[PDB]
Symmetry: D2
Subunit: 487 residues, 4 copies
């Protein structure tokens, strides 16, 4: 691939920063492409382009906007397999995942918001015969989205779909680890008829390009997906610069509670899907699995059985369902967590090492890893690993497990396995998390708002509420009576 350029105002354009970076294929170590990095002057160009495109976009009818987003949806469906293969090359996720999930659910959200544009309404409030109020849900203007590397094009769609549907232009910065699919999406939008400037894509690094966006005085909102620490830095700079509105989708340490009446085959299946999809690189993963003491030994055997069925290998093979981690530096961090678990006395049930042999020595592979006999003070239990590392924790009673599930600064997701009507709702209602699954894990419908409690996030994505949160309310009073001054 040739020097990948910036995408500004409906065309690829060379960056004026003079800086570049490389994205690596995590399966081979090869350079996928050299990518231009947006400089401070490039960000300002992108903002002025976005201001001009947004005015055209907002002036269109609601249904005209809806039709253009729907054309982008149709193109995404057509190009699913091509885009999935590129995503696999950039992220290391198996094609069996990227071709079935990444673009499908990204497009599902764009399709959803495309249809809701005409339903975006203000309100009207009578005060008295001589005065009333009405409100408008106006675009914020130019907004910025900052993506993460685990679901690059899905995240770009989940941020840009409500932003565009609400009448804004978005400047999107993909993660430096995985910048390629965002640039393809930018071409797809314009091909669908999106006006020039409404979706600009600026590859770059967080310390420079990301910061230039968070500081710009004419960007009205920042939406960020990433780690808890990076989020705090982003939200601070966005505030100190121009008091921007903020959305944050950060990591978690989500609990999966297995009830005493749970079927352990189902619970083990849910625990598997909550830990080893995308090689464990999912913010919502149920990485603390609480199991009753009386069932723990049997559950551990059922986990070992299923871990043995995991099929690592060629990411383009049909039967491969486990990939390398997104990068070699990230594998290093995941390995440090694994060593921490060993040094603190957690019992390694399986995995714990890199994969070796033909087809693995050149990739950032980590074996599916399960620790058991875990306790609430362990580093692997307290901190998000963002790798394929399950922690199993024994518990005795329902009140106890609720307290321990909630005793964390994280708040993203949670789940319970139980056939009992009262227990399922009763437990779920007490858990301090924004995304809660009963007898399942991971499904995130376009209709369902998702985001974190406590340190796991600010605001929400998806659902009707996220379309409204990309508008700002203007209240208008019409006074038809005589105005009275006290002077």
């Amino acid at each position: 691939m040739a020097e990948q350029q910036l995408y500004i105002h409906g065309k690829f354009v060379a960056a004026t920063s003079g800086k570049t970076f490389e994205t690596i294929n995590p399966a081979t170590g090869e350079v996928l492409a050299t990518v231009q990095a947006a400089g401070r002057e490039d960000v300002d160009r992108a903002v002025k382009s976005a201001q001009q495109g947004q005015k055209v976009w907002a002036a269109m009818s609601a249904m005209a906007r809806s039709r253009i987003l729907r054309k982008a949806v149709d193109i995404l469906r057509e190009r699913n397999d091509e885009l999935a293969r590129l995503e696999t090359l950039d992220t290391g996720k198996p094609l069996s995942e990227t071709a079935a999930v990444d673009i499908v659910t990204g497009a599902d959200v764009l399709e959803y918001y495309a249809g809701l544009i005409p339903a975006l309404e203000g309100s009207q409030i009578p005060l008295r015969d001589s005065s009333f109020v009405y409100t408008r849900r106006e675009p914020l203007g130019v907004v910025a989205g900052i993506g993460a590397w685990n679901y690059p094009i899905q995240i770009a769609l989940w941020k840009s779909a409500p932003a565009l549907a609400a009448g804004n232009a978005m400047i999107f910065k993909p993660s430096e680890v995985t910048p390629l699919t965002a640039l393809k999406l930018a071409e797809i939008y314009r091909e669908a008829g999106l006006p020039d400037g409404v979706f600009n894509v600026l590859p770059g690094i967080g310390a420079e390009t990301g910061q230039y966006l968070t500081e710009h005085p004419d960007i009205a909102k920042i939406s960020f997906t990433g780690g808890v620490a990076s989020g705090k830095k982003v939200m601070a700079n966005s505030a100190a610069s121009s008091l921007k509105e903020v959305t944050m989708e950060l990591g978690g340490k989500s609990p999966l509670i297995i009830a005493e009446d749970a079927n352990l085959d189902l619970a083990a299946d849910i625990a598997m899907m909550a830990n080893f999809y995308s090689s464990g690189q999912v913010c919502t993963n149920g990485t603390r699995v609480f199991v009753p003491a009386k069932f723990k030994a049997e559950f551990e055997h059922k986990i070992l059985e299923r871990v043995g069925r995991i099929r690592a290998g060629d990411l383009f093979a049909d039967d491969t369902n486990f990939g390398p981690l997104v990068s070699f530096p990230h594998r290093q961090n995941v390995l440090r967590y694994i060593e921490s678990g060993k040094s603190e006395g957690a019992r390694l049930l399986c995995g714990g090492d890199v994969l070796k042999g033909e087809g693995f020595d050149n990739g950032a592979w980590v074996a599916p890893t399960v620790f058991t006999d875990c306790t609430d003070d362990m580093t692997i239990v307290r901190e998000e690993i963002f790798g394929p590392v399950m922690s199993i924790l024994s518990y005795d009673d329902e009140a106890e497990v609720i307290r321990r599930a909630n005793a964390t600064e994280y708040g993203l997701a949670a789940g319970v396995v139980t056939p009992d009507l009262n227990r399922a709702h009763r437990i779920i209602h007490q858990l301090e998390a924004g995304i809660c699954w009963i007898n399942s894990w991971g499904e995130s419908p376009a209709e369902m708002p998702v985001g974190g409690y406590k340190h796991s996030g600010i605001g929400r994505e998806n659902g009707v509420m996220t379309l409204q949160s990309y508008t700002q309310v203007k209240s208008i009073q019409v006074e038809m009576g005589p105005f009275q001054s006290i002077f």
Copy 2:
């Protein structure tokens, strides 16, 4: 003098463990109203633990049980309106003619409004397929903190605490160090109304310490702040860096008042007066850039002079007084520096511009009502919020021009237009970059109407149904009744 004022934690007054105190002054006389204890770091932690325990009791009650308790507080506030207004006048220097008609009346209106909406707070249900559906809960945030400003102390305490409590939260409120007294009275009223202990705690103190300890505390889920634009940026930064708190910010503005070429100039002048000189100019939404057509500027200036001459400064408890001192001598000094900036930058002084002198004024920080004209967009008095009684009059030629100039600011709080024309009123208002827009009026802020700033003037909103919802957090719950399939 009043008795020494303590912290209010868990349904009773309690001594601070900081060992620190400050004084609140009567802005009209300079006398010490009271010595006030300042909450330390340990006091904030005690307040948070009290709030956590109270919130659980409050949230477990029925919706209508909560509604009835807030309504009892409303009834008390109506009965004690005049007494609370007199205290507010002593602490702020605002005339009783204002405080007895606006401050508690509109604060209680918002509490009364939210009290009735508690039972209407609902989540959603979304079918996915025959075998699965989603439902959502609007759950309390938990413990939230409000940080008040000094210009409308008890109104702000009510506008923040009413939706927070109605949504099932406990709130720790920190009043401005300038004006702590009515917030402590409000805490007693809530308890008398039946609010569980800990649900509304009040921590007087100074911003550098008590305010910071609240924004840093790991177990406070949301900060709501009212104040200046600069102070706002600092609060929002500390709230994010510490524990990623949800935030609401109601900051200042430089709001434009646009007088159309077809406006009646008596109405326009009355609106401009009320948009600049209420509460002695100490109002975030004031219309401090008055745009008038060139052809009408001379006549408009004359009508402003007539009305400014009628402003009545004097005894703040007298019925005919409608203008008070500024809240402090340091704040007046800043307003005086802006006025001197207007003179040196070439704006024409139409009236006022000086401190008030003589018996009854020497002990207060009074500034005469001030009007500048012949102003231009580059002047400091036109670009920056003064927060004093200083009107800037700007001439303009055409509608496209005035919309551009009205919007060419980092502020975004309020705006208004004066015109009898249907098309012009809606057409102009729709293009203005502000959250609060008034047509042929100024200042009215109904409990139903969400209010807040665009751009640097704010984050989020207050009042209206949406502010009840914004004090909850959404939990989405998927019920999967079909057999779960694992790909491993």
Copy 3:
């Protein structure tokens, strides 16, 4: 008491019909009172009064209306016991019910709507830069409620609360069987500050006073509670006369489904409360109880045990929990249904006869009655009895009981008893009823919309939606661009 008069424009006034009727105390057979009947001229006077009052009422602020309704609530709480005693004399329901339910839940709904008045808002819809639409939710004007006799004051509150909260005036006609508490409510409203004419009460008979209301050209909506047959007459006349909006809360034959995993003590408690409260005179009663064949014998035993604890007697006694039927003519109809059950081959498990002895010979008593071995073709199974008659039906599988529960023209309520998460939601989602209870029966929160599918009703009561349904939408387009004529 005296000769009960009409209530028009804030005062008691003599009827101009020249006609009266009597309401009987169902416990003694004695005449409680003679009540004047509103004629066609009385209805026209009530309507003109309502038009005048509604204009005053709607011109008030929203919070002014809220406070007045709240004062009525405070009065109702204070006079709960007094009002309940009057209700017991008129209806025959035990004081243990009327003092705990009738006024309490009537007032709860009024209290609920009082608080929602300020939240009643229209909408605003941008079309293009030069045109927008806004809507107003305007009062209907004058509406009429026609109450039933089983819950006289509760029904008066449930109809009048949303109607008044929406800015309307209501003319209320109580059932001729039970007119007394409705007149008390009219006094309470005026004492609370309700403008004269906003709530007028016209006692009379359905054949005359009710028909005059449904025919009046200046009444905008009729809300009716009663039997299915009477409802069809009312809704037709409302259509033929002036095309009125209509709400109908009619009877049902609601199924109670006991699952194979149900606790039979719980199922029996639910079945008892679903059949014998208010002596079986409740539209929502679960009068078809479906029980699995394998448990039928045990369930019947548990029902008989609980039936033996039912305490009929002095309606003002604390421990009395069962009363006479509302009238002797109604008892005659209930007895005919019981004899049909006997003759069609249903097995009589208990009851089936009037009660005899000192204190019962003078009242319209029917013993708690249970039939079992019932089949879907029996008259007692297909038709609403509106008396204390439980029908127990055996079933074998889940698909069958859903088909049989739904195989009816009625659609009011339904319920299931089961501890299983999937079974509770799965079954309830398939039942064709508007009011569904899981592991409970009867609770009707002010927040919860209630009403019938199929022949059991039109529209809903309670919930936010019922406040909205007492307004009518006006859409207003503001065209700020130049209008183009093609002529």
Copy 4:
């Protein structure tokens, strides 16, 4: 000539078993366009069992699957716009200049609108206490019936079927016996888009038989009817008497157009023209009572006559034709009876009042554009809907008077005001008793905007989000997780 037209049941054309047929006439020539089979009792029974089967398949699909199928129907309607418009012109007599720009365009706009809203159709969740909560489902009604009118045949079929299908129902549509042809084309288009067989069935026939059989059928859950005020009352009665069906009714009106004393009279004249002579006056919302201030009446009359003189009747397929014949010869007879009453009751005829004559008109149901003035509130032409091209001009003196006279009617469908004044426009409109109100325009009916009548002009609404919800029924579900308490 066209082939004999059959019923459309379960995804295919099928012969009626009634043994009866009727003819639809081309109103421009008097010729038979087609012979059309009429559905009997048994045909209606068969259509219902088909609809019951199809609805189950349709409702079981996901929301977005339903959305995509309706969007494909939209795409076909856009592609086939001109062909469908030409057929509508043949059946109705409306000029192609109208049908190709409005009828299918706005019909498809509403289908497109509801297609996108399907995934947003949500129930509610209500917490009661920690141990119990309520949630609601918005379930399909099942099989619903739509009964169309003849003035906008395919638009009405789309406005009724779009929310009904989008909400998960099947609809059986009966077109007017006057204009059955475009509804049958719509049924084929729906199937081509993937609509499951049975979800949209079409039963041509006459009101006394096919219409009544539908309103009486026990397994139809809701009836939506558009037509005349009298026919509506009969439909609503039979629907109640049979099985207590939910009802929607869009009936006629006598809508007032109020010209204010400050109105520009050219704008007022253009609005009045569009409010009276579009579709040859056959529009339920037409502004047939034009209220003009006395001081402007003579001049207003002159501007109306000038614009009436520009009306171009002729070949309905010509670009410049903008006026057509009435839909049928019996309908012209009724319009002529109303015109004669206006003359006999003393109203002044300004123009028109007779049929059009000559080559190209003698065989069509033509009535000249007609304007009466000096009208009074007691005249038959002022009190009753004519549904032809007859404008009544009424003088007035003051605003209170015209509001009272505008409202002094049993009709309530639409209304409008012409004024440049902000206060006058909103003030007057807020007092008018009509569901559809236009300020400085007439006739536009956005898919987003609920429309329907006050008083005798209707029950319920069409279009907007509320109409999607009104084609569902609410089920409230209480989950009790606490121990149930029996008093027995």
